[PDB]
Amino acid sequence: PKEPEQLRKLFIGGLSFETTDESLRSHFEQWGTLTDCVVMRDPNTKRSRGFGFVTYATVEEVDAAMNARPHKVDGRVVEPKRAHLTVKKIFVGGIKEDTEEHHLRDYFEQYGKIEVIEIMTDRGSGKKRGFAFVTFDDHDSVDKIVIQKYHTVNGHNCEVRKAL
Numbered sequence: 001p002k003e004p005e006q007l008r009k010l011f012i013g014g015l016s017f018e019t020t021d022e023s024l025r026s027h028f029e030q031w032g033t034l035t036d037c038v039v040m041r042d043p044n045t046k047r048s049r050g051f052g053f054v055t056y057a058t059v060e061e062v063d064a065a066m067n068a069r070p071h072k073v074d075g076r077v078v079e080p081k082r083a084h085l086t087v088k089k090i091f092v093g094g095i096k097e098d099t100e101e102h103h104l105r106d107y108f109e110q111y112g113k114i115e116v117i118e119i120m121t122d123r124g125s126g127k128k129r130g131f132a133f134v135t136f137d138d139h140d141s142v143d144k145i146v147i148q149k150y151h152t153v154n155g156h157n158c159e160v161r162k163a164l
């Protein structure tokens with residue numbers, strides 16, 4: 001059973017106008033099997049619109065491609081993103097009063113490199129409010145996190161969404 005195609009696609013922005021379907025494919029086939037690979041072009045001039053997309057056979061291949069950034073394609077560093085609200089911070093809710101920094105770190109560090117963990121406390125009492133923010137060094141960590149159906153941290157089923 002195949003993962004949904006939408007989860008296997010990478011939008012590639014910032015292309016060289018000389019990049020073709022063929023040269024984009026030759027580049028990104030290094031990290032997996034490509035079932036689709038298109039450069040977007042003007043319908044009348046055929047001049048590149050400077051972006052395109054590739055579809056891999058599996059999500060693990062998408063991961064491999066994202067972990068191989070930066071990608072220099074036909075001499076230009078391009079900008080791949082999963083199928084955009086491009087942020088590096090998440091809101092994590094439902095962690096109650098017993099969840100600590102190391103719980104959040106041990107779980108979320110496997111999505112990306114963590115720069116800040118902020119466990120929210122009440123301004124008046126100092127009691128934990130039951131939510132936190134995690135800031136990563138890169139947006140793909142967040143993009144991987146928010147497409148999961150479930151997040152279990154410290155036994156709690158958590159609500160996770162993009163923050164600012």
Ligand SMILES: Cn1cc(C(N)=O)c([C@@H]2CCCNC2)n1
Nearest residue numbers: 120121122123124125126127128
């Ligand atoms: C969100 N926030 C701001 C402050 C503050 N310093 O005004 C606080 C205090 C710090 C101690 C524990 N929570 C209460 N929490």
